[PDB]
From a paper:
ExoY virulence factors are members of a family of bacterial nucleotidyl cyclases (NCs) that are activated by specific eukaryotic cofactors and overproduce cyclic purine and pyrimidine nucleotides in host cells. Here, we explore the Vibrio nigripulchritudo Multifunctional-Autoprocessing Repeats-in-ToXin (MARTX) ExoY effector domain (Vn-ExoY) as a model for ExoY-type members that interact with monomeric (G-actin) instead of filamentous (F-actin) actin.
On the basis of these structural data, we designed a minimal functional Vn-ExoY module (residues 455–863) by removing the C-terminal disordered residues 864–895. This Vn-ExoY module (shortened by 32 C-terminal residues) shows similar catalytic activity to our original Vn-ExoY412-873 construct and allowed the determination of two additional crystal structures: (i) nucleotide-free Vn-ExoY bound to actin-ATP-LatB and profilin, with a sulphate ion in Vn-ExoY NBP (Vn-ExoY-SO42-:actin-ATP-LatB:profilin), and (ii) Vn-ExoY bound to actin-ATP-LatB with its NBP filled by a non-cyclisable ATP analogue 3’-deoxy-ATP (3’dATP), at 1.7 and 2.1 Å resolution, respectively. The Vn-ExoY-SO42-:actin-ATP-LatB:profilin structure is very similar to the structures of the VnE/VnEDM-PRM-Prof chimera bound to actin-ADP, with the Vn-ExoY switch A similarly disordered. (E) Structure of nucleotide-free Vn-ExoY in complex with actin-ATP-LatB and profilin (Vn-ExoY-SO42-:actin-ATP-LatB:profilin). In our nucleotide-free structures of Vn-ExoY bound to G-actin-ATP/-ADP and profilin, the Vn-ExoY NBP is still only partially stabilised by cofactor binding, showing that cofactor binding is not sufficient to fully stabilise the NBP and catalytic residues of NC toxins, as previously suggested. A SO42- ion is bound to the Vn-ExoY NBP via residues (K528VnE-CA, K535VnE-LID, S536VnE-LID, K554VnE-LID) that coordinate the γ- and β-phosphates of 3’dATP when this ligand is bound. To reach its most favourable binding position, the nucleotide must move ~4 Å (distance between the SO42- ion and 3’dATP γ-phosphate) through the LID closure.
Numbering used by the authors:
A (entry chain C): 1 to 139
B (entry chain A): 5 to 44, 49 to 375
C (entry chain B): 466 to 683, 727 to 863
């Protein structure tokens, strides 16, 4: 599918290190993602935690995206006009951690992970703008 | 072009320029309007000027418990800050404003709209007060206990991001402590009830109060000797002796039942806040407890928090309380740090972004 | 052993020498105790060395506000402000009309009185023998006074000194030839005590702990209260205060003898082994401190280093206080004097934020 063009668009300005568009209805699957990165390995169990009815068990010790442990910073998944979650990876020692935003549309999750030092607000705005474009195209 | 940093407190406005190590202006957060409200000197007075003319004006606090409640009066405060205190044209400076933890979405949207539409700032950013205090300590992960004049919060923060699900609020802060000290001195036969008497008691509180390491032991010492007594000269020339009131007043932070509140104390809400965070970050929070705000200035408060948190936590947990000497102003100082970094230019909301998205741009960009 | 914090490097003082100060050491000890009790850093401008005995006598008042007439540096009036400004320093002698008008207006406005000048025996001995400012006194028969002349200023003017008893004290009254006739010499005196004004203790700067900074209930009430504590501690008779409320204009003048050597007084924790930090040493290792606790600041560079050490220790000049402290700026700007805790935190945050 021509979904790779959306990944190229998200990765164009050099602020992000990973990006993905994931269908979450029925049997979830990665429609498009940056090859060899983390989001490409997202599982249906991980999608289930992101979109699940329970909005508190992921505060015990976070959640994973492609096996990468993340903490939830803001859960705006059920907030009108946002439908997003902001996360930050969890690593060891002085290893860098990165901001992630997930935005939910009618049929997809748009996921974006920033490079080191890229502010979560920049990633959230970028993810929001792509999700808005997809909603206009009935996705 | 220099960015401006404004910390709008329930009690005091702290304002200045990014890159400076202290605010240039610190003034009371009050607006005074004429008592005569008819039709046939000035529409309003702000801060220092408002208090001087207290006899002819009705004074109000536009921020209650850290949240803006009177928007018309808040615009008067911002106008005064820019034009009278800082002497700058707001349209020439990017402006960093602070907000309380858990500030409603409608309030942060209105603050954004007022900055761009009323003051025409070129860019702006809204930061949570406690996060800026953590930056002023040279950290990006930790848990801040911020207690000012109007509200107290425990705010755990991961890499510069406050964790709202774990924030705890205690609706008890410096003003309630002043009112409690007024009540317990009045119980001795003195009379501290008026607005002017409230200011005398606030001065007694700031000068002589402290946090006891062991409250019951300190009460027993106060009842068996005069070793803890201090004298204070009142404006009329009378001398009042402050004894167990010196430590009973801030003890209310640890025991809110003293003022009839059923809330847990600041040590218990610190534990509760840490426990609402991921298991993986809890050791880092316990080792990085930063105190900020005027109500954390009591001598002995860091040693008391160290003892109380040690008693709650697993015995093997490494606990550290950081209480910087400049903590009355660490929110402002942290804002000056953030707004002076080259990474800030990518964080601010520009007028172009505001024109494209409207006030809800503050949800996306500021957290 | 060496002190280091960012770009501030101070090497321990090798072979510390004693520095001559104008302020009597009895008063230096008082100010050292005030700095400790009030937990403030107090800086005082140098006092002219020759006026020390005048101040130590505790008989005179000190220079108040609104007095623009100049003091004298010659004759028996040395250290005082003569009503006739032809007897003042050279700058007044070359602008007589201007300075005589300042002296007369200070008396007409109630800010001063015209007072007789009495000197003690210590002063006569200093002027004749220690400083050789006056020629040896020669007794006259007709007046019963001793004639002398100055060895600097206008050496042709005779002065006449008379032994008098003023309230159980044996003093010398100064007389001169006013329009050719013997008359009592007049100096500017305080309007309450009526006593001649000597140099005062002019505060250079006051640096407070964070707790004492911020808005005030009432141009500063915090400085007014500290000045009252200082005058109370100095214990002079009511009306003979050495420190005055308020401050005169900044003035477009400089001269090193007017700002250095300054005497700073600091809280006693600065003198401990961990005074400047955990293992950074005591303040007296890097700054010249005398036996009375006076921290002696000799030049603008030392002042800048001292100010940085004080700001690093969370002592700052108030926002509400107005000072003209600086002179010969090595780097006396806002950006150059930022606290090292601020700069270190900014560096740490920049690193953590990916910069
Ligand atoms: N030395 C001190 N000891 C105790 N309390 C103090 C001290 N100094 C200031 N305070 C108190 O701190 C309060 C002001 O602190 P601060 O400026 O942090 O509050 P704020 O930012 O205006 O309020 P908030 O953040 O609650 O909206 C007042 O209640 C004041 O009496
Ligand atoms: C010196 C000072 C301190 C302060 O914290 O002031 C702030 C703002 C102030 C506003 C009213 C007051 C009469 C004006 C100015 C005093 C400002 O109210 C406070 O004093 C209130 C009332 S008593 C108390 O503890 N907080 C706090
Ligand atoms: Mg505050």
């Amino acid at each position: 599918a021509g979904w790779n063009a959306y990944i190229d668009n998200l990765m164009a300005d050099g602020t992000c290190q990973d990006a993905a568009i994931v269908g979450y209805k029925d049997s979830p699957s990665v429609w498009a993602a940056v090859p060899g990165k983390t989001f490409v390995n997202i599982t249906p169990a991980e999608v289930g935690v992101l979109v699940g009815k329970d909005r508190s068990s992921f505060y015990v010790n976070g959640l994973t995206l492609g096996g990468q442990k993340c903490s939830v910073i803001r859960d705006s998944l059920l907030q009108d006009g946002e439908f997003s979650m902001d996360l930050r990876t969890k690593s060891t020692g002085g290893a860098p951690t990165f901001n992630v935003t997930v935005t939910k549309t009618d049929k997809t999750l748009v996921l974006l992970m920033g490079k080191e030092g890229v502010h979560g607000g920049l990633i959230n705005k970028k993810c929001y703008e792509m999700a808005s474009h997809l909603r206009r195209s009935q996705y | 072009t220099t960015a401006l940093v404004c910390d709008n407190g329930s009690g005091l406005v702290k304002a200045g320029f990014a890159g400076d190590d202290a605010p240039r202006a610190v003034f009371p957060s009050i607006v005074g309007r004429p008592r005569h409200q008819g039709v046939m000197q000035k529409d309003s007075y702000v801060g220092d000027e408002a208090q001087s003319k207290r006899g002819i004006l009705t004074l109000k606090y536009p921020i209650e418990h850290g949240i803006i409640t009177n928007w018309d009066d808040m615009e008067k405060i911002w106008h005064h800050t820019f034009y009278n205190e800082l002497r700058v044209a707001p349209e020439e400076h990017p402006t960093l404003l602070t907000e309380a933890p858990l500030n409603p979405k409608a309030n942060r949207e209105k603050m954004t709209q007022i900055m761009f539409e009323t003051f025409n700032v070129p860019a702006m950013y809204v930061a949570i007060q406690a996060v800026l205090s953590l930056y002023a300590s040279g950290r990006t992960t930790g848990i801040v206990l911020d207690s000012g004049d109007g509200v107290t919060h425990n705010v755990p923060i991961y890499e510069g991001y406050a964790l709202p699900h774990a924030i705890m609020r205690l609706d008890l802060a410096g003003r309630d402590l002043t009112d409690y000290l007024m009540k317990i001195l009045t119980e001795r036969g003195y009379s501290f009830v008026t607005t002017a008497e409230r200011e005398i008691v606030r001065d007694i509180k700031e000068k002589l109060c402290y946090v006891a390491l062991d409250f019951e032991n300190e009460m027993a010492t106060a009842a068996s000797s005069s070793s803890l007594e201090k004298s204070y000269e009142l404006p009329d020339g009378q001398v009042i002796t402050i004894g167990n009131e010196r430590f009973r007043c801030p003890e209310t932070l640890f025991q809110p039942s003293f003022i009839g509140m059923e809330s847990a104390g600041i040590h218990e809400t610190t534990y509760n806040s840490i426990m609402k965070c991921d298991i993986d970050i809890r050791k880092d929070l316990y080792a990085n407890n930063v105190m900020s705000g005027g109500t954390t200035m009591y001598p002995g408060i860091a040693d008391r928090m160290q003892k109380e948190i040690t008693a709650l936590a697993p015995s093997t947990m490494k606990i550290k309380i950081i209480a910087p000497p400049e903590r009355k102003y660490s929110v402002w100082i942290g804002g000056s740090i953030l707004a002076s970094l080259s990474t800030f230019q990518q964080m601010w909301i520009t007028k172009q972004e505001y024109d494209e998205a409207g006030p809800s741009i503050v949800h996306r960009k500021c957290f | 052993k060496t002190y280091q914090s960012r770009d501030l490097v101070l090497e321990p003082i090798q072979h510390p020498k004693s520095i001559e100060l104008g302020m009597p050491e009895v008063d230096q000890s008082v100010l050292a105790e005030v700095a400790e009790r009030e937990n403030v850093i107090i800086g005082v401008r140098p006092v002219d060395e020759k006026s020390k005995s005048l101040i130590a006598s505790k008989m005179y008042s000190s220079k108040g506000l609104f007095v623009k007439a100049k003091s004298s540096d010659w004759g028996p009036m040395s250290g005082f402000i003569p009503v006739d400004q032809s007897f003042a320093k050279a700058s007044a002698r070359r602008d007589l009309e201007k300075f005589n008008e300042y002296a007369e207006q200070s008396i007409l406005s109630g800010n001063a009185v015209s007072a007789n000048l009495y000197l003690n025996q210590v002063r006569i001995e200093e002027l004749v023998s220690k400083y050789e400012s006056l020629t040896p006194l020669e007794l006259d028969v007709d007046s019963g006074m001793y004639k002398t002349t100055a060895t600097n200023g206008d050496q042709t003017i005779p002065f006449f000194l008379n032994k008098v008893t003023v309230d159980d004290k044996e003093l010398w009254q100064v007389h001169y030839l006013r329009e050719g006739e013997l008359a009592p010499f007049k100096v500017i005196g305080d309007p309450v005590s009526k006593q001649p004004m000597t140099a005062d203790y002019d505060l250079l700067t006051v640096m407070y702990t964070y707790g004492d900074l911020g808005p005030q209930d009432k141009v500063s009430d915090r400085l007014k209260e500290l000045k009252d504590v200082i005058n109370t501690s100095l214990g002079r008779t009511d009306g003979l205060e050495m420190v005055h409320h308020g401050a005169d204009d900044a003035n477009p003048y400089a001269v090193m003898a007017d700002n250095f050597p300054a005497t700073f007084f600091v809280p006693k924790h600065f003198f401990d082994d961990d005074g400047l930090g955990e293992g950074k040493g005591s303040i007296q290792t890097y700054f010249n401190v005398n036996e009375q606790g006076a921290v002696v600041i000799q030049n603008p560079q030392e002042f800048s280093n001292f100010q940085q050490v004080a700001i690093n220790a969370s002592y700052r000049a108030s926002l509400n206080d107005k000072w003209n402290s600086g002179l010969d700026s090595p780097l006396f700007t806002t950006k150059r004097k930022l606290s090292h805790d601020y700069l270190d935190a900014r560096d740490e945050v920049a690193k953590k934020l990916g910069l």
